[PDB]
Amino acid sequence: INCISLGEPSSIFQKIFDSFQDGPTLQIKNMQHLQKFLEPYTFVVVLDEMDRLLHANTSETQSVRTILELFLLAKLPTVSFVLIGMANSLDMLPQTIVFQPYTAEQMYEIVIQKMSSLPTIIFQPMAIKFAAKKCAGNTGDLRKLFDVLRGS
Amino acid sequence: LSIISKYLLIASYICSYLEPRYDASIFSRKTRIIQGRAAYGRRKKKEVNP
Amino acid sequence: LHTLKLIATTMNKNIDYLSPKVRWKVNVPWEIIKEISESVHFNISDYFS
Amino acid sequence: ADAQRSHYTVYPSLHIPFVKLLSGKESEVNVEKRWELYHQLHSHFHDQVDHIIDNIEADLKAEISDLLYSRRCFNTIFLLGSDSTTKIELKDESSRYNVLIELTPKESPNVRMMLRRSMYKLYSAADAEENDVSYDLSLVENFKRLFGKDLAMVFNFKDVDSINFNTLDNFIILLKSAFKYDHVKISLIFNINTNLSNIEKNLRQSTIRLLKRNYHKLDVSSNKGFKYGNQIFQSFLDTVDGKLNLSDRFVEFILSKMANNTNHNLQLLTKMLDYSLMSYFFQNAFSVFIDPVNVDFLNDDYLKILSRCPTFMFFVEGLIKLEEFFVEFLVRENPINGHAKFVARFLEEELNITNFNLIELYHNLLIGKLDSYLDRWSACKEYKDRLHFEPIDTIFQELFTLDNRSGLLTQSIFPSYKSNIEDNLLSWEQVLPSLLSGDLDKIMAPVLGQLFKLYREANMTINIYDFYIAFRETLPKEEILNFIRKDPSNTKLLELAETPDAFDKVALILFMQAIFAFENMGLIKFQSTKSYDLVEKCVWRGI
Amino acid sequence: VIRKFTKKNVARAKKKYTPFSKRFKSIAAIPDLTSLPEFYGNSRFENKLKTTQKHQIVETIFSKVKKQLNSSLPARENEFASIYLSAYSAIESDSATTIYVAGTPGVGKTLTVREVVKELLSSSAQREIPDFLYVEINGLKMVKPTDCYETLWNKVSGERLTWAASMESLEFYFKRVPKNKKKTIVVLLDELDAMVTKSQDIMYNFFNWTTYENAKLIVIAVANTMDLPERQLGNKITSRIGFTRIMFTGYTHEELKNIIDLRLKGLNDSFFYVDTKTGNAILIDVRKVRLRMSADAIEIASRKVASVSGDARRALKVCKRAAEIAEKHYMAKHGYGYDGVQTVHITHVMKALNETLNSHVITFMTRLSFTAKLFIYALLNLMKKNGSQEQELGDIVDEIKLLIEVNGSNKFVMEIAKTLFQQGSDNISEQLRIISWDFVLNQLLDAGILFKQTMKNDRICCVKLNISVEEAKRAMNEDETLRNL
DNA sequence: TACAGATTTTATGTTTAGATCTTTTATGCTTGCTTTTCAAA
DNA sequence: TTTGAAAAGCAAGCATAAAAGATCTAAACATAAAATCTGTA
């Protein structure tokens, strides 16, 4: 579930139900209903853009209301729920995994592996390494390197 | 109002209209085993009628 | 006394009584507290002399 | 973990609370019969108490109605000493509509909302008794054009002392504009908790002149003339008549605690009497013997615990200078309650005296100072010899007596709450019992109680590091590390204990957990929003 | 039932709530949407505003010049080539892409994008590229910012849905529908800063659909500012928009000349049959009249506009205003009505340029009454006395009283003191404010010369100059009386 | 299918409860000088 | 009976907490037309 294409954050539990439902349609407005639906059964939900679950203008404690419910039910006994939440650090207990920004050698590897399907590589390789070195750094965004080579 | 409520109101009026650093110069009436001096009080009275 | 509005706080709505940052004041006139002090025969006017 | 949740429901896995007395040698049927005796006495008390509650609510409704129904002004009623829980019902006027509009201070944030709630209530009630309109005072103007009959509005302002008097004044002046309509009658009811002058100093002088044209004061409090507290105390005395005695110290405790509550006296009196009845029937083994059926179930423990009476002490000392004797003295009635009934009836009927407290009268009759209590009236000088009673002393009265010597009523109903917290924290021997960590328990105090003594001897602003240094000096460095090395199954603890600053680190951890425990309790506060370097003490012992 | 309030003016559109993901039983059941009658677009009011003339109106020689200079591409060729190459490569490879374009007003962004998509539609008409659907969404022409969701889906499917259902439908259409059942869509997002809400969900969704593999979507985003994503957008949206951004610079004066002379190709240095009875001119009693615009007049207009903004609208409006001034001078001397050689030379262009640049503010305070100027003079004196840029109104009252009572030897003050404090009556008592005190205060507030604070105490309420102090003193020095004292 | 009623969805208005920021005013710290009771002679 | 001397009192200046309120927002409360869902028929 991409969480930006959602009306309110508090409907995410309902959004978890509509993925896993054939059947009856229940009203889920809290953690408790989704818990008691998932108690008599495993279930893996990938939540892209976790930052959209934050409630704006509602003080520091009550802003993280839905995320505490999700990450608390994600650890509760005798329920079967794995919750994978990806987010972005520049725009914002569970196990934390960090995707570090790409380096120039990794960008070279990605670029030649993507260009492998073509009959030939139209770039010189010092050009690709220069583009990778000029695009990497504290913001190793692969989109920027793709844009630079496309603009070339 | 009761006996406690009237005296609580009286004490609230005293707290609101007297400065706290003159408190030990008025109500302090217990004797001492350790050496010590109470507050002397106001050296000159103000003319503002608080 | 806080319910009867004879004592007020700085906060008037959503006031928590238990915070140490909450201060207290009397709101009665001098004549009302004089009537109260003379109803229990307390001599409050000595304290302002 | 549900302890990290805000709220959670539990469905747990799965015959009287009365316990076995006489050092665990009571009969089981004595316990059950005590339970039924408490139930019948408690029921006999509360039937009278709820009848009295119904009577006071009905009389107040009748008196308010007689004031409300007895030209171009309000009919104003000031209910002095009102707690705003009185139901007001109106009369059903032929070819007129009568509506009651209730307004709390929460429903009164400004004049607009006050008028809008009043007109919604008026329109809803009128259409309920008989198209949308705008909820303003033109509905009052066009009332007879829609509904065909005239209007009587009774405004009941609850908690005026809590209302904004500017908003109330503007709402009254707004309602004054409705006097220009021939079909409108407006009554105002002001429930006042303190007095009339405190609210006349808060309104405008023009508003006072407006309200003075047709107004009635009516002083109706719970503690008015003792007509209702004496009825509840008489109901209790009729309940415990012929079985139980009231000590004079218990009655003076009732008087002292009733003097400290003004708005809610009768619930406090019922609560105190109920808890004393509970304590007697839970504690005393002779509660079975308050009725003459159970005279055939006395044993050696009963004779052991009835022989230790100071009245029995004086009686056998006078006889010098058992079961049959104990059974023989149940037939007596102790007519002090009947004498108090007769004195109250005489004072209410023959002498036309209603302002008296039966609890004070019973207290003076128990002491033996009924004449000195009656001296306040200067009308019983001719009848003091008729109205006087000598207090008869009854053998074995201590085993049938409601009293407070143990401090049980004081600890249960009106405790010195903060003083108990302070006394426990300073002492802690009277809380923690004396008996792995046995070597450290003899030397080191509990951390909160140890820190509280340094708190007590420190000044009003304490430096937190010097407070820590003093707490570190109070602790022994050898035995603390010995007790932390006594467990060999904790590898990180054994690693930390061999480091030379382990005593300081352990002392700091215990000190900081105690410091934020004190912060949550409210003993200390921090003099910043970002610093943690000086604390202020907020609590002094003995206050 | 009795209602607490009423909503008697609710007008609700007929839009369904069911999204496109539920329209078919499965992904494999979705047909070819290109072969669907209502998909991809496969003017009912234009007869309302017509009437019969019943008159033959006069079109003078300058009228054709003024119609040729209206806003309704010699200088945009590199930007055209870049936008065209990116959109062409994205169309004929079935790729999804974002082309970002920014610029100051009137530099030809919308015109270049529209000509690019016109030439692309001409290319797809002759089967050089696959056929696509062109959609325009202008963020300033939406009532609600979510209505773009309603618009684009209605342009794609023909359905009328509500906005959350429309955006769910668009998400399903771009993400899940296969490419062989779809068509390419080119979306022009004009006035992108108007599509920025508090939560940037619309911007994220529109630029995140372009990062979907199946979408076949090209978004041309037109913005005011080069660094609008860096100023107002999150890092995810700034990453999705891209690093390659196209700047539309303001025009130089040679290009503004090229634009203006492209507007004046068919009538500049040309002859007209003028018909001097009425002045109604016909392009080839009646005279053959040459019409010209001075090349140096276009030079100075283009140079001034190119230095100030580079706006093509501003240059065209300057030349049109010059033609209007020349036409007014022409019709004044003949009385032609509306029913040799005439030249739009340098001075008409200079009068058109300077009429936007001369300030009425000093001219406005020059022609005020004595009491308003006395207010301004006292405010300036208080501002120089206590150094504050904010003065209490009671101080201004006392300063006006002091200036009247100190300069009591001035003849004008002698003549005007009785008017100012008694309205010349000797039946009106002496007043604490001057006559027209509240009038001139409110007048200076409506003009925007003054700012006043919202306090109900009149004496301690403060007043500020909203205009320059140098302009105020230059206005105050023009008066004969106030420059003396 | 098929129509009538029930429920939901989307949409907007009404009122209360609370957060955030800003400006003005109390409050306490620091330091130097002056009054006043007090432990000792 | 005195006597210096330290505890206590007062003022100027300034940094800073707190109060009051201006401005705004979320959420509870409230209504309502169109779409959608049952649900027998």
Ligand SMILES: Nc1ncnc2c1ncn2[C@@H]1O[C@H](COP(=O)(O)OP(=O)(O)OP(=O)(O)O)[C@@H](O)[C@H]1O
């Ligand atoms: N290169 C050009 N050649 C001819 N006319 C031009 C040129 N550029 C602009 N114009 C004229 O100026 C008008 C304004 O151009 P356009 O609408 O494209 O501006 P824009 O850059 O989108 O500005 P804005 O940000 O104000 O929307 C055009 O309608 C056209 O009449």
Ligand SMILES: [Mg+2]
């Ligand atoms: Mg444009």
